[PDB]
Amino acid sequence: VGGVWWFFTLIIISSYTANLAAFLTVERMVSPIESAEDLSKQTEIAYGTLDSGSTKEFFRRSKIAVFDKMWTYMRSAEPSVFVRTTAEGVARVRKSKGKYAYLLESTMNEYIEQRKPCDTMKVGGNLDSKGYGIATPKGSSLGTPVNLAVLKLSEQGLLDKLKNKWWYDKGECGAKDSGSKEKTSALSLSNVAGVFYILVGGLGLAMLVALIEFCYKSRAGLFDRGVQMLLTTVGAFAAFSLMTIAVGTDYWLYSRGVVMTHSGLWRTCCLEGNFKGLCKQIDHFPEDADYEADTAEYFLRAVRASSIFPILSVILLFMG
């Protein structure tokens, strides 16, 4: 008994260990994206652009390898991966739990990242090289002057300064970026903690049995011997009776499918809208489920045989 029980617990603890490893192995397998090529190599995470604009027209006309496949996907992706406005796109990313990515201008993106609730971030480098500029009527007097002015401002780092002023400084967040640093990246104390509480709980239970034990010793049971036999007999009888009640519980399983189905070993029932319930008295249940499951005969019904035997054994035991 001690040997078989040992072999039993050996298998279980081995199973627990092995199983716990797959959940940790896969937990590491997870690799967030980072580049555009990552969006094409996978399909789990949907993605799209604005329904109208240079962004969408870019992929459509792009003859580049990666961007080509991306467009092919978005072109026939269902439901529509394209949004009406930029606000809708951001909202879709914030409500998809990371299942939807949105492609937009880096400038507007970087700004969004610095806005509450600070739940969005730009990943990887840009897909193409663009640039804004000061526009002046063809053949204007301000033409050359403004041109040089822009170059002068950039070299004085005044342009970079301005951007920092309205994008990062103006924030704000300014907090959601310091937490996005991506420091942590290991296991944790959480799971292990649950095992610590059950330990202290066991220690406390023992500290209670110690005092209790002492008290008992001091006291020193004979009363129970007389009324203990009667007590134990009626407890056994009560347990047996309830076991029989449990087996017949017109509810061994409920298979919701909104109707409502509940079954035991004898009846399969259904509650229709609204409230009316009907039952198909069949009595126990081996049927044509092609189960087998590879031997011959025994179940369904096998549970019937074990329950009936249990009650017969309990009756013989109660009597004796």
């Binding site: 880096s106 990943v123 526009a135 002046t136 950039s154």
Partner: protein, 49 residues
């Protein structure tokens, strides 16, 4: 607009003498460089994720 062949927005107000200069996040595109003049980029960008 392909049909009317009319420019709209800021680029429009420049070609039709409504304004003297356009200071905004105006993208430097070939289609625009033909009708107006673009100073050197004051901010380089692109498409992101």
């Amino acid at each position: 607009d392909a049909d009317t062949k009319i420019w709209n927005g800021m680029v429009g107000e420049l070609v039709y003498g409504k304004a003297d200069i356009a200071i905004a996040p105006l993208t430097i595109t070939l289609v625009r460089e033909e009708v107006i003049d673009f100073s050197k980029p004051f901010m380089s960008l692109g498409i992101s994720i």
